[PDB]
Short mmCIF file of N, CA and C and ligand atoms in Angstrom, two decimals:
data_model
loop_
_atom_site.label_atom_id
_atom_site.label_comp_id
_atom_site.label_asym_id
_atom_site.label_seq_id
_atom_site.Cartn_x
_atom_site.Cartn_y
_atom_site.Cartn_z
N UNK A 1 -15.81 -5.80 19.85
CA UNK A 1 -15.68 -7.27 19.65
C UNK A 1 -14.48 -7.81 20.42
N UNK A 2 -14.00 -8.91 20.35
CA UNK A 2 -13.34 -9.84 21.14
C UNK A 2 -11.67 -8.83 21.39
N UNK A 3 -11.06 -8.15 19.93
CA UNK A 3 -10.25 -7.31 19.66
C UNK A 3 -9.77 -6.37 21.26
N UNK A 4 -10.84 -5.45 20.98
CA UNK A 4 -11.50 -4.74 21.73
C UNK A 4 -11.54 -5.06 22.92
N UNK A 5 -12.29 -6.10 23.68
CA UNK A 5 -12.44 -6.67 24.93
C UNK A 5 -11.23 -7.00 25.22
N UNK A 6 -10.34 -7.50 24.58
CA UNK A 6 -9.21 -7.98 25.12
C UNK A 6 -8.41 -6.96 25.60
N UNK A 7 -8.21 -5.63 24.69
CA UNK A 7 -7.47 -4.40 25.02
C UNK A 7 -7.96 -3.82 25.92
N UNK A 8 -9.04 -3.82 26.51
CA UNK A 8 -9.39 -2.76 27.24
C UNK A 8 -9.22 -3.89 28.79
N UNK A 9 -9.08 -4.92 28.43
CA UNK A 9 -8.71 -5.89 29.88
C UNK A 9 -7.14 -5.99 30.20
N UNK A 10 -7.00 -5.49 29.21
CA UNK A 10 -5.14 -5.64 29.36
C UNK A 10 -4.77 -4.68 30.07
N UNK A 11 -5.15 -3.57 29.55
CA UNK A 11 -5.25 -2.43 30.11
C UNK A 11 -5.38 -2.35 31.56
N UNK A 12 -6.15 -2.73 31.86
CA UNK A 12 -7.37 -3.13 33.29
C UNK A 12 -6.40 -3.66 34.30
N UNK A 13 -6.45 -4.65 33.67
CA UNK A 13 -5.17 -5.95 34.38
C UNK A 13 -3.35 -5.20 34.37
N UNK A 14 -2.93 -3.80 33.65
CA UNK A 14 -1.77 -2.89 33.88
C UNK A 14 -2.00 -2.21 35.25
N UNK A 15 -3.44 -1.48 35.53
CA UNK A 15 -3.34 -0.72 36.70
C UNK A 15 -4.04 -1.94 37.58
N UNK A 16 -4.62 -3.05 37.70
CA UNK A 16 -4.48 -3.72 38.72
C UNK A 16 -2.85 -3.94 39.01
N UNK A 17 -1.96 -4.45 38.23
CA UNK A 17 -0.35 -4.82 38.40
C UNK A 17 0.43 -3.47 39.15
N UNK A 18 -0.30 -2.15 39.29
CA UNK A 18 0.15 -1.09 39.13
C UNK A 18 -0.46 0.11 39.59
N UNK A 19 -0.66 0.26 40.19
CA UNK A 19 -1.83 1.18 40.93
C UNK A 19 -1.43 2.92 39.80
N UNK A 20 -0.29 3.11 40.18
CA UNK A 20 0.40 4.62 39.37
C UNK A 20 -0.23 4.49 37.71
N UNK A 21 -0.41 3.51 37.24
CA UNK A 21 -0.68 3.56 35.90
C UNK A 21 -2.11 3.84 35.61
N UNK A 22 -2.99 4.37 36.92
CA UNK A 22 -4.39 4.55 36.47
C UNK A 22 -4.47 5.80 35.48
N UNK A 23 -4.16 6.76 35.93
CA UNK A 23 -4.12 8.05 35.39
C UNK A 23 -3.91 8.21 33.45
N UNK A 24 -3.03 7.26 33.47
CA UNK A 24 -2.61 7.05 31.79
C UNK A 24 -3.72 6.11 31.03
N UNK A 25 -3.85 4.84 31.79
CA UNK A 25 -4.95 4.44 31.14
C UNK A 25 -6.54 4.92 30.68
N UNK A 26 -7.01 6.26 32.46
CA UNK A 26 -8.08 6.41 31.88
C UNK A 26 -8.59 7.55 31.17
N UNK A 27 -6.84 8.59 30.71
CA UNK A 27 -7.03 9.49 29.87
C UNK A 27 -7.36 8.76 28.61
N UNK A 28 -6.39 7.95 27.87
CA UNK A 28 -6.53 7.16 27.04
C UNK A 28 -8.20 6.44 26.54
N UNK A 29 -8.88 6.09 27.83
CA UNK A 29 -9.88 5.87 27.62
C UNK A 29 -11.31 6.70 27.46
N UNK A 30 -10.65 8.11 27.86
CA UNK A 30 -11.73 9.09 27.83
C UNK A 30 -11.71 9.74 26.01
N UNK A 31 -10.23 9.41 26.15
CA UNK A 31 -10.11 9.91 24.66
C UNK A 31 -10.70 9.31 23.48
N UNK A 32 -10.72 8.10 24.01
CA UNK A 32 -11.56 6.40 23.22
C UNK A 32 -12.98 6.60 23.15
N UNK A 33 -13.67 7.26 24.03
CA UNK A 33 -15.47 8.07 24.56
C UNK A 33 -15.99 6.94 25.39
N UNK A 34 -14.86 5.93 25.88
CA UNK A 34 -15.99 4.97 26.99
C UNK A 34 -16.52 5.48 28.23
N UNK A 35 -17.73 5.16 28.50
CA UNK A 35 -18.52 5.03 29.37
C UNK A 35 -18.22 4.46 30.63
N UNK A 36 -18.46 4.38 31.95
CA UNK A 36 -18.50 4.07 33.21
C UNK A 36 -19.34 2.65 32.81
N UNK A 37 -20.87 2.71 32.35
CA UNK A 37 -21.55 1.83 31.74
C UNK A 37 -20.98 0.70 30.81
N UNK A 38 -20.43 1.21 29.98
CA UNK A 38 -20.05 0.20 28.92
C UNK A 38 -18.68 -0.30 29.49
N UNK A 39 -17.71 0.31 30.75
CA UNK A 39 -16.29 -0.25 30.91
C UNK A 39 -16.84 -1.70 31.45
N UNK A 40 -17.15 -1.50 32.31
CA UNK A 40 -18.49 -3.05 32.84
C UNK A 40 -18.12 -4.41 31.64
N UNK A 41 -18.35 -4.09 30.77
CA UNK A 41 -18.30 -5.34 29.61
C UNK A 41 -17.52 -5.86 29.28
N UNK A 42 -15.47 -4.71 29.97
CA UNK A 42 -14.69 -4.84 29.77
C UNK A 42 -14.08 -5.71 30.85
N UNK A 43 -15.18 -5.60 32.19
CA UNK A 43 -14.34 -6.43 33.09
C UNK A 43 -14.95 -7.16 33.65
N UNK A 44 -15.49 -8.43 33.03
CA UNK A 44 -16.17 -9.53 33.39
C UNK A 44 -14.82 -10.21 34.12
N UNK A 45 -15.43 -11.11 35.05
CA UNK A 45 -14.82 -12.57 36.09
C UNK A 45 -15.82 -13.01 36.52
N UNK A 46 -14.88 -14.32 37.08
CA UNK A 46 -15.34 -15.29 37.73
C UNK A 46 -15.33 -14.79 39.07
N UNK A 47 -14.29 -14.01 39.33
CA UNK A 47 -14.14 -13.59 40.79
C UNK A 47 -14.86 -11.81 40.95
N UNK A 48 -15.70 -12.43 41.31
CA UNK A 48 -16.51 -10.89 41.96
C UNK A 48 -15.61 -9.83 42.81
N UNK A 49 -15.96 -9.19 41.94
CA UNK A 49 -15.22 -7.78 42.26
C UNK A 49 -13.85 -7.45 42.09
N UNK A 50 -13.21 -8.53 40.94
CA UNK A 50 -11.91 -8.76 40.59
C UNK A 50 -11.45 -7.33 40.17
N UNK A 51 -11.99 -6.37 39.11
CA UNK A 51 -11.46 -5.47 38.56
C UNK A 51 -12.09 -3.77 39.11
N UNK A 52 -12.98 -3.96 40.41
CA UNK A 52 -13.26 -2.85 41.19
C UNK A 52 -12.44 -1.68 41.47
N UNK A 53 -11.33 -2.29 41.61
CA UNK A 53 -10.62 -0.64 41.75
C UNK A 53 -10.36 -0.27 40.62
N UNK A 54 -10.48 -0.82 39.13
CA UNK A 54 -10.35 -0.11 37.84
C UNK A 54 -11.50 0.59 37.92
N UNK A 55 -12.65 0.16 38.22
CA UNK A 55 -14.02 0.56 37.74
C UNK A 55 -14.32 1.94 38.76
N UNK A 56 -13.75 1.69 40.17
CA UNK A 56 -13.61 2.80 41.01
C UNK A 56 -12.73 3.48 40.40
N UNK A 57 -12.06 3.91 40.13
CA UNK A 57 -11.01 5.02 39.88
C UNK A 57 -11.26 5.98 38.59
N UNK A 58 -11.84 4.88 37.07
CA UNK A 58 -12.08 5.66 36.49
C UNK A 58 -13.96 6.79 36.63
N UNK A 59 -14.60 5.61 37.33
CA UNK A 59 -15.52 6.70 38.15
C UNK A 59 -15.13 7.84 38.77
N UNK A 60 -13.98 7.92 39.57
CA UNK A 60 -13.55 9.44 39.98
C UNK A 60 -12.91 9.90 39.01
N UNK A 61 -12.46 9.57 38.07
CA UNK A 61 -11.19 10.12 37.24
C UNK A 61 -12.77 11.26 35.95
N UNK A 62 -14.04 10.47 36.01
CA UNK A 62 -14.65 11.18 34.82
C UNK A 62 -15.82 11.66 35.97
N UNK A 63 -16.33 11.14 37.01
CA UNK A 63 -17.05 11.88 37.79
C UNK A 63 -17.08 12.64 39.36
N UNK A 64 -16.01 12.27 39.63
CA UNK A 64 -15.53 13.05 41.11
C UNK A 64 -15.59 14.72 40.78
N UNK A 65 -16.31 15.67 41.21
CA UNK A 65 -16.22 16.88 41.27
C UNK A 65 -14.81 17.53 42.08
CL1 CL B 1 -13.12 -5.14 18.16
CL1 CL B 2 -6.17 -4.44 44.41
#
């Protein structure tokens, strides 16, 4: 819910401010059990493709071999 959405954009919006802070956020989030699928819900805009390098990174961080 809204709770929720907000934290996981805050988050989002730390390693956009921050590139080094990916690593912490998306242990944190693996530990949480989100999805590649469901992070999506977390990063709606107006501006297309605003939160892509969150969405790229934790894609390699849970599926890069
Ligand atoms: Cl919530
Ligand atoms: Cl960027």
């Amino acid at each position: 819910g809204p709770t929720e959405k907000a934290a996981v954009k805050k988050m989002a919006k730390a390693i956009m401010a921050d590139p080094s802070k990916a690593d912490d956020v998306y242990q944190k989030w693996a530990d949480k059990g989100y999805t590649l699928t469901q992070l999506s819900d977390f990063l709606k805009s107006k501006t297309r493709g605003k939160y892509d390098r969150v969405y790229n990174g934790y894609m390699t961080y849970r599926d890069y071999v």
